[PDB]
Design a protein around this nucleic acid. Sequence first.
DNA 1: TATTAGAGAACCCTGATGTTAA
DNA 2: TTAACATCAGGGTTCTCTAAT
Lengths: 97, 97
Amino acid sequence: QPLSPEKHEEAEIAAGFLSAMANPKRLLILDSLVKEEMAVGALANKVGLSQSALSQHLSKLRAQNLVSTRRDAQTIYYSSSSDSVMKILGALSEIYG
Amino acid sequence: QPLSPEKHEEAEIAAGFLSAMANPKRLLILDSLVKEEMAVGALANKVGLSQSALSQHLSKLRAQNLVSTRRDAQTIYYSSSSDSVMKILGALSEIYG
DNA sequence: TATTAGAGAACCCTGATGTTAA
DNA sequence: TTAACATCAGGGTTCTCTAAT
């Protein structure tokens, strides 16, 4: 028996989320943001990424609703309070010790 | 100030794994294979995939060592007994109910 | 059955241009 | 103007399907 289109739907969404997490630098980002608030520049020096590239990664994380922001003047502070991210990171830390 | 190259590597491996899982059809596949043994044809007909495409996806799953194979000479049976896969799927099913 | 090649799109960098607040 | 980010434009790389007269 073939799978019901709803299962396909679920798999599609889950895959979108996982894909948002399925990148090394993005993973480092989510780790760091889960543990603290950071300015984009500081993030750039923490994952060793350029401002443009990191801003794109952050945009893709925003696309999946994986990060939150607060504004102070010209500086934006990113953080992560996504249950999903913490669950996945938890599983990952259970796997690789 | 920046993350240690060791952390970069950890992130690389974890991201490689997640990338292996970050696909809808592949997710359905890993679900089905985690819960039972199946022949390639049956898999192809339950996830709504062609033989070639499914064979390619399974090739990628094998590349990350997320599945095992058994031969009945003309028929090959795929299965999954990776704790990591079950952890990620567990988290996913914890999220989306 | 697994392997190939190819089209079309998504990815992910660099570098330049936009947006927003002091 | 400067400062901190966002987004655009391009080009190389990677994905995932179909075709295999």
